[PDB]
Amino acid sequence: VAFTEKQDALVSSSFEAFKANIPQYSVVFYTSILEKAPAAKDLFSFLANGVDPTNPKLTGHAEKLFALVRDSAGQLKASGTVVADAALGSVHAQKAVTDPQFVVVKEALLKTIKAAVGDKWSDELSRAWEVAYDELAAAIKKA
Numbered sequence: 001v002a003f004t005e006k007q008d009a010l011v012s013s014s015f016e017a018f019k020a021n022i023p024q025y026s027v028v029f030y031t032s033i034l035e036k037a038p039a040a041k042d043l044f045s046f047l048a049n050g051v052d053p054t055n056p057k058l059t060g061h062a063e064k065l066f067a068l069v070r071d072s073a074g075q076l077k078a079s080g081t082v083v084a085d086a087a088l089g090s091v092h093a094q095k096a097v098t099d100p101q102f103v104v105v106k107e108a109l110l111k112t113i114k115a116a117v118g119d120k121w122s123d124e125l126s127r128a129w130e131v132a133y134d135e136l137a138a139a140i141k142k143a
C-alpha cells in the first residue's frame with residue numbers, strides 16, 4: 001500500500017489541529033456515530049450517560065483512537081503495511097464491530113477532521129486519513 005511522505009505530513013498536521021480541542025471535536029465524532037449506529041450507545045462504557053465533553057474517559061478514548069490512525073499513516077509511509085496489537089484485535093471481536101460499523105466510524109472520523117481543519121480541508125487531506133483508517137481497520141479485523 002503506497003503511502004507517501006506528503007500524505008503522512010497531511011495527517012500528522014491535521015491531527016495536531018484535532019489535538020487543539022479534544023472535548024469539542026470528540027463531540028462531533030461521537031454524535032456522528034450515535035446518529036448512524038444503533039448499537040453504539042450500549043457498546044461504549046462511557047457513552048452510558050450520553051456525549052459528555054467533560055468525561056475524560058470519552059475524551060481520552062477519542063484521543064487514543066486518532067493517535068492510532070495517525071500512527072497507521074506513519075507505519076504505511078515507513079513500510080507500506082500496518083499491524084494492530086492482538087489486544088486491540090480482540091476487544092473488537094465481540095460483535096457490533098460489524099463491517100458497516102467500520103464505515104460509520106470512518107465517516108465520523110473524516111467529519112471530525114473536517115471540523116478541526118476549517119479552511120485547510122481538501123480532498124487530498126480526506127484521502128490521506130481514509131487510507132490510514134482503512135489499513136488499520138483491516139489490520140484490526142485480522143490481528
Ligand code: HEM
Nearest residue numbers: 043044045064065068069091096097101102105133136137
Ligand atoms: C479502525 C478504527 C478503530 C480503532 C482505531 C479503534 C480503536 C479502539 C481503541 C483504542 C479501543 C480500546 C482501548 C481500550 O482497551 O479500552 C477501542 C475500544 C472499543 N471500540 Fe474501537 N476502534 C475502531 C473502530 C471501532 C468500531 C467500528 C466499533 C464499533 C462500534 C468500535 C467499538 C469499540 C468498543 C465497543 C470498544 C470498548 C470501549 C471501552 O474502551 O470501554 N471501534 N477502539
